[PDB]
Paper text:
Similar to the crystal structure of [name]_N in its native form, the molecules are arranged in head-to-head dimers here as well, with small variations between them, likely due to crystal packing. The binding mode was identical to that in the co-crystal with [name]_N, with an overall RMSD of 0.855 Å.
Centriole biogenesis begins with self-assembly of [name]-6 proteins into 9-fold symmetrical ring polymers, which then stack into a cartwheel that scaffolds organelle formation. [name]-6 proteins contain an N-terminal globular head domain followed by a long coiled-coil, and a C-terminal region predicted to be unstructured. Moreover, [name]-6 homodimers can form higher order oligomers through a weaker interaction between two head domains from neighboring homodimers, with a ~40° angle between the two coiled-coil pairs.
Residue numbers in the entry:
A (entry chain K): 0 to 92
B (entry chain A): 15 to 159
């Protein structure tokens, strides 16, 4: 078959407080994307938002500058449940 | 009353729909569908399905459907459905996917239709063959949220 996970995840543009992430969509018709962001090795609980399945980019705002964040995109499809098929990257804002 | 805090989104994306209104021309437009499962504030034991139809272009175009487990039984008998309320959302999603994946030269062809006539609008997904428009799902939507 073909993979149900997003392929290439990178920070395309950035502000000291906000990030714009891009991914290459999986070949499967995606129902929704769930994005989780949190500080790498921080004490704070992870933040999560949802974006439509037609979208291949997302914006994370309210971030603290010069901090390492871990960003994960979860893609839901016919054969992928909500938090299956994850792609993660690390970025320093 | 739906508890949006305890609600889970299963499906949030545009779907191609043929929209028919009494005094306007038929339009093939991509409408954003959001499907949510959750419980009511009045009772965590009552499970509810929510479907919201919206347009990114028009802020006055809103249609909503809420189906309770009791309501599903009437829907199950009238439409010959063979699955439980738990599997009901996934089947609706698969039918919506077939409308999205439909190609121009398809026979039979899957098509989604929203018919707006006054206070109600009826949403249907049909398979069009040589004989008839055979109904896969027919749902009654109310204007608003």
């Amino acid at each position: 078959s073909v993979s149900s996970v997003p392929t290439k995840l990178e920070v395309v543009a950035a502000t000291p407080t906000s990030l714009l992430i891009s991914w290459d969509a999986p070949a499967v018709t995606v129902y929704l994307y769930v994005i989780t962001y949190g500080e790498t090795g921080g004490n704070s609980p992870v933040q999560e938002f949802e974006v439509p399945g037609s979208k291949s980019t997302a914006t994370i705002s309210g971030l603290k500058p010069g901090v390492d964040y871990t960003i994960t995109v979860y893609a839901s499809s016919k054969h992928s449940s909500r938090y299956a098929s994850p792609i993660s990257i690390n970025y320093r804002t | 009353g739906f508890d949006l805090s305890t609600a889970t989104t299963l499906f949030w994306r545009p779907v191609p729909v043929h929209v028919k209104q009494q005094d306007r021309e038929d339009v093939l437009e991509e409408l954003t569908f959001r499907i949510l499962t959750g419980v009511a504030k009045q009772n965590h034991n009552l499970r509810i399905l929510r479907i919201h139809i919206s347009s990114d272009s028009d802020l006055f175009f809103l249609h909503t459907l809420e189906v309770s487990e009791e309501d599903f039984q009437s829907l199950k008998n009238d439409q010959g459905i063979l699955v439980d309320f738990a599997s009901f959302p996934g089947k609706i999603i698969s039918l919506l996917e077939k409308c999205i994946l439909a190609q121009p030269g398809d026979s039979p062809r899957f098509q989604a239709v929203l018919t707006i006539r006054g206070g109600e609008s009826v949403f249907k997904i049909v398979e069009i063959n040589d004989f008839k428009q055979l109904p896969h799902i027919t749902l009654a939507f109310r204007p608003g949220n």
